[PDB]
DNA sequence: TTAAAATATTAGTGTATTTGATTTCCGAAAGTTAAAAAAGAAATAGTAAGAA
DNA sequence: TTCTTACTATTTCTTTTTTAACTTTCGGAAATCAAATACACTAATATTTTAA
């Protein structure tokens, strides 16, 4: 099924010579799991994207698909000097069916239909080790002191961890766990959204100084700021 | 899956497919080979592969044994190290008592005769150093010193401190007398200067020119006659005197260095002689430096300056497609190209690696265009430390040959400038050719040699190079005391090794196929990994923070005994 | 309502432009038949059906009479890229109007039903024509030379009306009715794309004739109210539209099958007799008499024989035979209905509000009309075929009357008295016979001596004078008359590429 | 008599671009399974002698 | 003279076997890679033609 239309091809045997390149950009399905959803797959006999080139770029906008995994992996094995990958109206995405390479930090998104997480919540309940209730109920303090005011998210419940009953051991652990999801990105910026399936977990550096926003929360509540 | 696989696997590379990358791949799901697919990253074992995989492990081992613990690396404790209220004019004071000025002149015409390629490392006009040795009597009996007089002060002693380290130790008994210092130290009168005496002396002179300095408020002032004193004082062993406080100076001469924001050094049409020459000077200041910044490169210098002098290749691959001052900085930036694999396990491939082999003919001739007068100490101690260096760099690359890649008869060149380097030694102990056996440089280049034929002849018995292993055991002992217990440590080393040597032999390798379990491996395992323990500050860190307390089978039970035995630690003070 | 934004957000802005152009010509075309009166634009009242959206693409894309833009279709560099063109826009065509019908359904029109599969089968249908159309493109395509120059079809077809096929099958093809019967199965599979079961269940009193079209020849097979279900309806109609060419002309070799099998030879081929047809019921005779038959007068001929016959006709034209392509169903096929809306699609008073019915122009007869022409092998671009005064040389009905004039006293017997489809059958019989005198001369221009003439009375120079007629320059031109196939003319009109067909005496 | 207008060497630095490996795998050839066709025999529906 | 009585294609159904289409190892051969060059700006200053 690794089969492509001829301007394409064209396009991608003429692609090398820019040297002034950034912000690549695909919006068909197919051709998008033929072209930079690496899969594992290092040889087509042409439709090679050209090494230097992959080097080369800055970010990658991806337009509008279904899932990006539709395979068992969205990969960026390439593309090594990334830094804004943002996905516009895919459907579903897991974000753990995603590599993300080397280091990028804004990753950005909107109008999707589905939405995973990367299950940060139960790997928080490994380590502290509660019931979810618990976690739910003794854990939420749902801080909103002057700063979180600043915007509404009304739609939303802006949670946030007790000082209390964590001794700030299992708490630096528990964050530095949320952290090892991100692989050190930044920003994330949530705008129109339909359907997490888990709960919303932020590391606390990461929204104050509001690197992460929401704009158009409407399928969605329940951020709990950790 | 998750955290899915990495590269084509051993199912792979049997059937020479595309390789869908799951676990345990799209490869390995399809005809069940998830056996083929583990088994590929117990008993004995009966191959040599043990023998690519230790070479690779003796890269790591020449970055941390050959390299930090024993040589880069002071431990100390802020308890046990004690303040500085007491000999802190004392000493100093007695040592400028001690020293008189015929005692000084026949030290600088020493030098002046004999280590010209030092001051013209530094200052050029000696005779220049000789007023200020006239102008220091006078202002010995001053008291209201200038800040310039006493960057004078600091420089002439940083240079007796020079004269100290490279006098043989008859010249010095003529000039000295052993008893009026033994009384003062009250140490052993019995000894000799050489036996540690000249080295003692030499570090006093160190420590008094430092604290010359520290009256200079040089933190306060500073100026390049900080940085000419320093690489004065970095020729000694004194790096590993104080290798803490060597990485200081060297961070302070750096600061003081690029104080000035000066980059290239050949100046205009148009300036000042006194300026073109200045900045001239600042050019050969500038190698030296950069020659001790790469000299002292450890965990333990975090400040970098080689990094921004370019590498020679990228220049010299154009063309091909003083002198000798310049030169000794080809030789050592050649290294500095050569050695950033020390802690990279990737391999350097084969063809800048023969870059730097058919430029280094080359260099070799040019170390041949080099003369040598038997009149002029100056210029065998010229030419010879060239001709130590152009085979110290060949004797690293063919080792680089023959451990990535097995290139024939690298051994053969290994032997070879082992041999060259051995009669260079052999040619030291000639009259006006004493002191270069003193020179660091053999300190290193020679412990790497060691090492590497000690690693080779622990496991590949040749008896070539166990013969060469017999005539470095002899220059074990043909050595100078003025390097002490680095010496002597590495006297433990060339031990602890050839004790290696007895227990890889007596034991069978054993492994799980691939895993060659062998308890000297285990040894060597642990030999870098306490080392690597003891460089970290975090624990200092913890320390200095205060109430925050710091805290903490047969191939099991030989690894117990030997190191129970040989603690790799025993190479501290 | 919760449909908004995943229909908007679905597309490129782009693309709901093209669709906007595509369904506003949809929605100006349902106003030029007044389907949406006459800017009055609702929503829940637009029907969109599969038929009505065929019909939009019918009177749009093919309908090139338009004497205006008649002939770019001509030059092979204007239709090598207009045709493209076309398939392109029509698949465009197709998903703006699928877009259009989810759109109906948010505003919640009822009236509006897609049934995609069966324009899926128009998209696959054109795409077969244009395909079709594009392998043909060259002699030298690539380095073949007479192969893809060679039609399964025809080369078959011509080398079976010769009266001998001496090293094919003395065990098989002695008789003429035999090779005739096999060339009607054989055009039965060419022409009309079935299985051998689909070839088995043809009755005479299925095969009807042009209700506005006087040429159709349907074969109005409809499921008799019983396969899971009642209401009969699923309705596959089928034309067997002549051909120019004498010799794969359906109504031809139909003629002629029938006349042997009728009367034959007065001598050897004593035929199967003319039927009754006086006490015929509806239902009753053409009902039971089968298209072809072999020593059974009733039922179809056996599987395995015609499996022989066809492995022993592709190996002698040296043809590669698979047998599922032949005798199992393919795809490429006819179109498929209801009973809904074949009463209620194709009731005009339904639709009587509109200043046309469909039924007249592009439904020859409830016929899909590339549905006619592609499988009748046509550029199916003109809506308004007007070949029929196409005739040199009108045969004369006296020389018609001489064979099958039972059915001349028939309708000089008591007309009313016979049953509805057997003068109906009788009519179709008398086309039949016109054809097959039309095409008569070639057949003895070039097989002299086949059982057709093994009666003298057109040995009479009558019919040879009507030869001489329709053979006239033949002697004396270098290439043919009659027309070939729409990519292999400018080869076999040519009389030489013409011979190399046959193999015996050329 | 020359300042004005305007190249060449070496050097310092920097950046595309091969490179021999080296890696990862594709085009083609052997299995695998399902259809087609003759083969073979088991009815079989006609099918010409032999009396009453 | 048309009921027996086994011929006689026939034909029907099963076999087999033969056909052919679909899936799978194997030599070669393209797709990256950290150097490793060859290129390549670019500057400073010596370098190539003329009246008061
Ligand atoms: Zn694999």
Same mark, same amino acid.
């Given at each position: 099924?690794?089969?492509?239309?001829?301007?394409?091809?064209?396009?991608?045997?003429?692609?090398?010579?820019?040297?002034?390149?950034?912000?690549?950009?695909?919006?068909?399905?197919?051709?998008?799991?033929?072209?930079?959803?690496?899969?594992?797959?290092?040889?087509?006999?042409?439709?090679?994207?050209?090494?230097?080139?992959?080097?080369?770029?800055?970010?990658?906008?991806?337009?509008?698909?279904?899932?990006?995994? !539709?395979?068992?992996?969205?990969?960026?094995?390439?593309?090594?000097?990334?830094?804004?990958?943002?996905?516009?109206?895919?459907?579903?995405?897991?974000?753990?069916?995603?590599?993300?390479?080397?280091?990028?930090?804004?990753?950005?998104?909107?109008?999707?239909?589905?939405?995973?997480?990367?299950?940060?919540?139960?790997?928080?309940?490994?380590?502290?080790?509660?019931?979810?209730?618990?976690?739910?109920?003794?854990?939420?303090?749902?801080?909103?002191?002057?700063?979180?005011?600043?915007?509404?998210? !009304?739609?939303?419940?802006?949670?946030?961890?007790?000082?209390?009953?964590?001794?700030?051991?299992?708490?630096?652990?528990?964050?530095?766990?949320?952290?090892?999801?991100? !692989?050190?990105?930044?920003? +994330?910026?949530?705008?129109?959204?339909?359907?997490?399936?888990?709960?919303?977990?932020?590391? !606390?550096?990461?929204?104050?100084?509001?690197?992460?926003?929401?704009?158009?929360?409407?399928?969605?509540?329940?951020?709990?700021? +950790? | 899956?998750?955290?899915?696989?990495?590269?084509?696997? =051993?199912?792979?590379?049997?059937?020479?497919?595309?390789?869908?990358?799951?676990?345990?791949?799209?490869?390995?799901?399809?005809?069940?080979?998830?056996?083929?697919?583990?088994?590929?990253?117990?008993? *004995?074992?009966?191959?040599?592969?043990?023998?690519?995989?230790?070479?690779?492990?003796?890269?790591?081992?020449?970055?941390?044994?050959?390299?930090?613990?024993?040589?880069?690396?002071?431990?100390?404790?802020?308890?046990?190290?004690?303040?500085?209220?007491?000999?802190?004019?004392?000493?100093?004071?007695?040592?400028?008592?001690?020293?008189?000025?015929?005692?000084?002149?026949?030290?600088?015409?020493?030098?002046?005769?004999?280590?010209?390629?030092?001051?013209?490392?530094?200052?050029?006009?000696?005779?220049?150093?000789?007023?200020?040795?006239?102008?220091?009597?006078?202002?010995?009996?001053?008291?209201?010193?200038?800040?310039?007089?006493?960057?004078?002060?600091?420089?002439?002693?940083?240079?007796?401190?020079?004269?100290?380290?490279?006098?043989?130790?008859?010249?010095?008994?003529?000039?000295?007398?052993?008893?009026?210092? %033994?009384?003062?130290?009250?140490?052993?009168?019995?000894?000799?200067?050489?036996?540690?005496?000249?080295?003692?002396?030499?570090?006093?002179?160190?420590?008094?020119?430092?604290?010359?300095?520290?009256?200079?408020?040089?933190?306060?002032?500073?100026?390049?006659? @900080?940085?000419?004193?320093?690489?004065?004082?970095?020729?000694?062993?004194?790096?590993?005197?104080?290798?803490?406080?060597?990485? =200081?100076?060297?961070?302070?001469?750096?600061?003081?260095?690029?104080?000035?924001?000066?980059?290239?050094?050949?100046?205009?049409?148009?300036?000042?002689?006194?300026?073109?020459?200045?900045?001239?000077?600042?050019?050969?200041?500038?190698?030296?430096?950069?020659?001790?910044?790469?000299?002292?490169?450890?965990?333990?210098?975090?400040?970098?300056? %080689?990094?921004?002098?370019?590498?020679?290749?990228?220049? *010299?691959?154009?063309?091909?497609?003083?002198?000798?001052?310049?030169?000794?900085?080809?030789?050592?930036?050649?290294?500095?190209?050569?050695?950033?694999?020390?802690?990279?396990?990737?391999?350097?491939?084969?063809?800048?690696?023969?870059?730097?082999?058919?430029?280094?003919?080359?260099?070799?001739?040019?170390?041949?265009?080099?003369?040598?007068?038997?009149?002029?100490?100056?210029?065998?101690?010229?030419?010879?430390?060239?001709?130590?260096?152009?085979?110290?760099?060949?004797?690293?690359?063919?080792?680089?040959? @023959?451990?990535?890649?097995?290139?024939?008869?690298?051994?053969?060149?290994?032997?070879?400038?082992?041999?060259?380097?051995?009669?260079?030694?052999?040619?030291?102990?000639?009259?006006?050719?004493?002191?270069?056996?003193?020179?660091?440089?053999?300190?290193?280049?020679?412990?790497?040699?060691?090492?590497?034929?000690?690693?080779?002849?622990?496991?590949?018995?040749? *008896?070539?190079?166990?013969?060469?292993?017999?005539?470095?055991?002899?220059?074990?002992?043909?050595?100078?005391?003025?390097?002490?217990?680095?010496?002597?440590?590495?006297?433990?080393?060339?031990?602890?090794?050839?004790?290696?040597?007895?227990?890889?032999?007596?034991?069978?390798?054993?492994?799980?196929?691939?895993?060659?379990?062998?308890?000297?491996?285990?040894?060597?395992?642990?030999?870098?990994?306490?080392?690597?323990?003891?460089?970290?500050?975090?624990?200092?860190?913890?320390?200095?923070?205060?109430? @925050?307390?710091?805290?903490?089978?047969?191939?099991?039970?030989?690894?117990?005994?030997?190191?129970?035995?040989?603690?790799?630690?025993?190479?501290?003070? | 309502?919760?449909?908004?934004?995943?229909?908007?957000?679905?597309?490129?802005?782009?693309?709901?432009?093209?669709?906007?152009?595509?369904?506003?010509?949809?929605?100006?075309?349902?106003?030029? &038949?007044?389907?949406?009166?006459?800017?009055?634009?609702?929503?829940?009242?637009?029907?969109?059906?599969? /038929?009505?959206?065929?019909?939009?693409?019918?009177?749009?894309?093919?309908?090139?009479?338009?004497?205006?833009?008649?002939?770019?279709?001509?030059?092979?560099?204007?239709?090598?890229?207009?045709?493209?063109?076309?398939?392109?826009?029509?698949?465009?065509?197709?998903?703006?109007?699928?877009?259009?019908?989810?759109?109906?359904?948010?505003? /919640?029109?009822?009236?509006?039903?897609?049934?995609?599969?069966?324009?899926?089968?128009?998209?696959?249908?054109?795409?077969?024509?244009?395909?079709?159309?594009?392998?043909?493109?060259?002699? /030298?395509?690539?380095?073949?030379?007479?192969?893809?120059?060679?039609?399964?079809?025809?080369?078959?077809?011509?080398?079976?009306?010769?009266?001998?096929?001496?090293?094919?099958?003395?065990?098989?093809? $002695?008789?003429?009715?035999?090779?005739?019967?096999?060339?009607?199965?054989?055009?039965?599979?060419?022409?009309?794309?079935?299985?051998?079961?689909?070839?088995?269940?043809?009755?005479?009193?299925?095969?009807?004739?042009?209700?506005?079209?006087?040429?159709?020849?349907?074969?109005?097979?409809?499921?008799?109210?019983?396969?899971?279900?009642?209401?009969?309806?699923?309705?596959?109609?089928?034309?067997?539209?002549?051909?120019?060419?004498?010799?794969?002309?359906?109504?031809?070799?139909?003629?002629?099958?029938?006349?042997?099998?009728?009367?034959?030879?007065?001598?050897?081929?004593?035929?199967?007799?003319?039927?009754?047809?006086?006490?015929?019921?509806?239902?009753?005779?053409?009902?039971?008499?089968?298209?072809?038959?072999?020593?059974?007068?009733?039922?179809?001929?056996?599987?395995?024989?015609?499996?022989?016959?066809?492995?022993?006709?592709?190996?002698?034209?040296?043809?590669?035979?698979?047998?599922?392509?032949?005798?199992?169903?393919?795809?490429?096929?006819?179109?498929?209905?209801?009973?809904?809306?074949?009463?209620?699609?194709?009731?005009?008073?339904?639709?009587?509000?509109?200043?046309?019915?469909?039924?007249?122009?592009?439904?020859?007869? $409830?016929?899909?009309?590339?549905?006619?022409?592609?499988?009748?092998?046509?550029?199916?671009?003109?809506?308004?075929?007007?070949?029929?005064? $196409?005739?040199?040389?009108?045969?004369?009905?006296?020389?018609?009357?001489?064979?099958?004039?039972?059915?001349?006293?028939?309708?000089?017997?008591?007309?009313?008295?016979?049953?509805?489809?057997?003068?109906?059958?009788?009519?179709?019989?008398?086309?039949?016979?016109?054809?097959?005198?039309?095409?008569?001369?070639?057949?003895?221009?070039?097989?002299?001596?086949?059982?057709?003439?093994?009666?003298?009375?057109?040995?009479?120079?009558?019919?040879?004078?009507?030869?001489?007629?329709?053979?006239?320059?033949?002697?004396?031109?270098?290439?043919?008359?009659?027309?070939?196939?729409?990519?292999?003319?400018?080869?076999?009109?040519?009389?030489? &590429?013409?011979?190399?067909?046959?193999?015996?005496?050329?």
């Amino acid at each position: 099924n690794q089969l492509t239309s001829i301007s394409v091809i064209r396009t991608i045997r003429s692609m090398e010579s820019m040297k002034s390149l950034r912000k690549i950009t695909v919006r068909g399905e197919k051709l998008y799991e033929l072209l930079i959803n690496f899969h594992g797959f290092r040889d087509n006999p042409g439709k090679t994207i050209s090494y230097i080139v992959k080097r080369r770029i800055n970010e990658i906008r991806l337009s509008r698909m279904n899932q990006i995994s !539709r395979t068992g992996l969205a990969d960026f094995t390439r593309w090594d000097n990334l830094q804004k990958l943002v996905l516009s109206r895919v459907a579903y995405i897991d974000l753990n069916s995603i590599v993300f390479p080397k280091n990028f930090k804004s990753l950005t998104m909107k109008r999707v239909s589905k939405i995973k997480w990367w299950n940060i919540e139960e790997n928080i309940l490994k380590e502290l080790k509660v019931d979810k209730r618990t976690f739910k109920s003794l854990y939420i303090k749902e801080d909103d002191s002057k700063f979180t005011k600043f915007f509404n998210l !009304r739609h939303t419940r802006i949670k946030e961890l007790d000082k209390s009953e964590i001794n700030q051991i299992t708490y630096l652990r528990c964050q530095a766990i949320v952290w090892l999801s991100f !692989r050190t990105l930044n920003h +994330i910026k949530l705008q129109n959204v339909s359907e997490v399936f888990n709960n919303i977990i932020v590391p !606390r550096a990461l929204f104050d100084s509001k690197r992460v926003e929401i704009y158009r929360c409407e399928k969605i509540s329940q951020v709990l700021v +950790i | 899956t998750q955290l899915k696989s990495k590269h084509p696997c =051993s199912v792979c590379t049997r059937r020479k497919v595309k390789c869908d990358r799951m676990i345990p791949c799209g490869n390995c799901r399809k005809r069940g080979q998830d056996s083929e697919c583990m088994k590929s990253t117990i008993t *004995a074992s009966s191959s040599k592969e043990y023998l690519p995989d230790l070479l690779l492990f003796w890269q790591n081992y020449e970055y941390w044994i050959t390299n930090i613990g024993l040589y880069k690396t002071k431990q100390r404790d802020l308890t046990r190290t004690p303040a500085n209220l007491d000999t802190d004019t004392e000493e100093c004071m007695f040592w400028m008592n001690y020293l008189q000025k015929d005692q000084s002149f026949q030290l600088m015409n020493f030098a002046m005769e004999n280590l010209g390629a030092l001051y013209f490392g530094s200052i050029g006009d000696i005779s220049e150093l000789y007023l200020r040795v006239e102008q220091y009597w006078d202002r010995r009996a001053d008291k209201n010193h200038s800040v310039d007089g006493k960057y004078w002060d600091a420089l002439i002693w940083s240079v007796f401190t020079m004269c100290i380290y490279y006098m043989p130790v008859e010249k010095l008994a003529e000039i000295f007398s052993v008893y009026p210092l %033994h009384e003062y130290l009250g140490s052993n009168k019995r000894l000799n200067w050489e036996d540690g005496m000249q080295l003692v002396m030499c570090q006093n002179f160190a420590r008094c020119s430092l604290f010359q300095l520290k009256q200079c408020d040089f933190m306060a002032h500073p100026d390049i006659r @900080l940085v000419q004193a320093y690489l004065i004082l970095a020729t000694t062993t004194f790096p590993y005197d104080e290798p803490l406080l060597a990485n =200081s100076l060297l961070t302070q001469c750096i600061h003081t260095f690029k104080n000035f924001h000066v980059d290239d050094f050949r100046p205009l049409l148009n300036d000042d002689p006194v300026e073109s020459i200045a900045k001239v000077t600042l050019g050969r200041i500038f190698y030296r430096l950069c020659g001790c910044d790469y000299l002292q490169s450890g965990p333990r210098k975090p400040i970098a300056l %080689h990094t921004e002098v370019s590498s020679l290749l990228q220049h *010299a691959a154009y063309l091909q497609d003083n002198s000798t001052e310049v030169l000794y900085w080809k030789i050592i930036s050649l290294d500095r190209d050569l050695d950033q694999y020390l802690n990279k396990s990737s391999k350097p491939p084969l063809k800048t690696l023969d870059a730097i082999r058919r430029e280094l003919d080359i260099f070799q001739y040019k170390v041949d265009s080099l003369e040598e007068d038997f009149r002029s100490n100056n210029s065998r101690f010229q030419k010879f430390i060239a001709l130590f260096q152009i085979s110290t760099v060949s004797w690293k690359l063919f080792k680089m040959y @023959l451990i990535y890649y097995d290139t024939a008869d690298s051994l053969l060149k290994v032997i070879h400038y082992s041999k060259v380097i051995i009669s260079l030694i052999v040619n030291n102990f000639h009259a006006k050719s004493e002191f270069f056996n003193r020179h660091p440089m053999v300190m290193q280049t020679i412990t790497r040699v060691v090492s590497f034929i000690s690693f080779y002849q622990i496991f590949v018995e040749s *008896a070539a190079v166990k013969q060469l292993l017999v005539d470095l055991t002899e220059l074990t002992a043909n050595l100078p005391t003025i390097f002490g217990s680095k010496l002597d440590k590495l006297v433990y080393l060339t031990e602890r090794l050839s004790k290696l040597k007895l227990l890889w032999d007596k034991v069978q390798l054993l492994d799980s196929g691939d895993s060659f379990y062998h308890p000297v491996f285990k040894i060597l395992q642990n030999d870098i990994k306490i080392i690597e323990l003891k460089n970290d500050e975090m624990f200092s860190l913890i320390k200095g923070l205060g109430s @925050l307390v710091p805290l903490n089978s047969d191939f099991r039970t030989i690894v117990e005994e030997f190191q129970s035995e040989y603690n790799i630690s025993d190479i501290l003070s | 309502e919760d449909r908004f934004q995943e229909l908007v957000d679905s597309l490129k802005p782009r693309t709901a432009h093209q669709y906007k152009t595509y369904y506003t010509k949809y929605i100006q075309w349902c106003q030029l &038949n007044q389907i949406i009166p006459t800017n009055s634009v609702p929503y829940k009242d637009l029907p969109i059906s599969a /038929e009505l959206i065929h019909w939009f693409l019918l009177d749009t894309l093919i309908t090139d009479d338009k004497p205006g833009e008649k002939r770019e279709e001509t030059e092979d560099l204007d239709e090598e890229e207009e045709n493209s063109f076309k398939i392109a826009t029509l698949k465009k065509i197709i998903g703006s109007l699928n877009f259009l019908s989810k759109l109906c359904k948010v505003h /919640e029109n009822p009236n509006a039903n897609i049934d995609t599969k069966y324009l899926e089968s128009v998209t696959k249908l054109h795409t077969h024509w244009i395909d079709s159309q594009k392998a043909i493109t060259t002699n /030298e395509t690539n380095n073949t030379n007479t192969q893809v120059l060679c039609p399964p079809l025809l080369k078959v077809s011509l080398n079976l009306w010769n009266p001998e096929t001496n090293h094919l099958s003395e065990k098989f093809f $002695k008789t003429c009715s035999e090779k005739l019967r096999f060339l009607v199965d054989f055009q039965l599979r060419s022409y009309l794309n079935l299985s051998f079961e689909e070839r088995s269940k043809i009755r005479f009193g299925s095969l009807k004739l042009g209700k506005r079209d006087r040429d159709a020849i349907i074969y109005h097979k409809v499921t008799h109210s019983a396969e899971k279900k009642d209401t009969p309806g699923h309705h596959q109609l089928l034309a067997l539209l002549p051909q120019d060419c004498p010799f794969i002309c359906p109504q031809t070799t139909l003629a002629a099958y029938l006349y042997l099998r009728f009367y034959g030879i007065p001598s050897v081929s004593k035929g199967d007799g003319f039927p009754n047809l006086n006490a015929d019921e509806n239902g009753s005779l053409l009902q039971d008499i089968p298209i072809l038959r072999g020593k059974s007068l009733t039922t179809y001929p056996r599987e395995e024989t015609f499996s022989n016959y066809y492995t022993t006709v592709f190996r002698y034209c040296h043809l590669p035979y698979k047998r599922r392509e032949y005798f199992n169903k393919c795809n490429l096929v006819y179109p498929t209905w209801d009973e809904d809306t074949f009463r209620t699609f194709f009731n005009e008073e339904n639709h009587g509000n509109w200043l046309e019915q469909p039924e007249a122009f592009a439904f020859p007869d $409830k016929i899909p009309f590339d549905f006619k022409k592609i499988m009748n092998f046509k550029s199916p671009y003109t809506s308004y075929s007007t070949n029929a005064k $196409k005739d040199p040389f009108p045969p004369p009905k006296d020389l018609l009357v001489q064979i099958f004039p039972e059915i001349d006293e028939y309708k000089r017997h008591d007309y009313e008295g016979l049953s509805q489809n057997s003068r109906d059958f009788l009519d179709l019989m008398e086309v039949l016979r016109e054809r097959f005198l039309s095409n008569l001369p070639w057949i003895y221009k070039f097989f002299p001596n086949h059982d057709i003439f093994q009666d003298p009375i057109f040995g009479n120079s009558d019919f040879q004078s009507y030869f001489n007629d329709k053979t006239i320059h033949s002697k004396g031109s270098p290439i043919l008359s009659f027309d070939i196939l729409p990519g292999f003319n400018k080869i076999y009109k040519n009389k030489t &590429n013409f011979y190399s067909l046959l193999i015996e005496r050329p």
